[PDB]
């Protein structure tokens, strides 16, 4: 009841899963060498070829 920080393993597992998911969803915002990171702009601005 009083002393905390005795449940490290479960918290570590949850943290690892959440952090992996967050970094995966954050990866979507990169440019990857193109001129825009949003696909709608690149489809609506430039010639399909």
């Amino acid at each position: 009841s009083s002393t905390a920080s005795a449940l490290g393993k479960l918290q570590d597992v949850v943290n690892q899963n959440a952090q992996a998911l967050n970094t995966l969803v954050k990866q979507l915002s990169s440019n990857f060498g193109a001129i825009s990171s949003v696909l709608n702009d690149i489809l609506s601005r430039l010639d399909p070829p």
């Binding site: 001129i35 609506s44 601005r45 430039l46 010639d47």
Partner: protein
């Protein structure tokens, strides 16, 4: 118009431009553009030119 070493730079803003009536003009020797498809110049909207 001025010379190449003293090219005339001007700002165009706060107006409803019309490139369709200008693109169809046949008096131009060449008309080559980078980064945008000309047919999609009638729906894009910029801040200043």
């Amino acid at each position: 118009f001025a010379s190449v070493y003293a090219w005339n730079r001007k700002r165009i803003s706060n107006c409803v431009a019309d490139y369709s009536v200008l693109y169809n003009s046949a008096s131009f020797s060449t008309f080559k553009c980078y980064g945008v498809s000309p047919t999609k110049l009638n729906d894009l909207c910029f801040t200043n030119v």
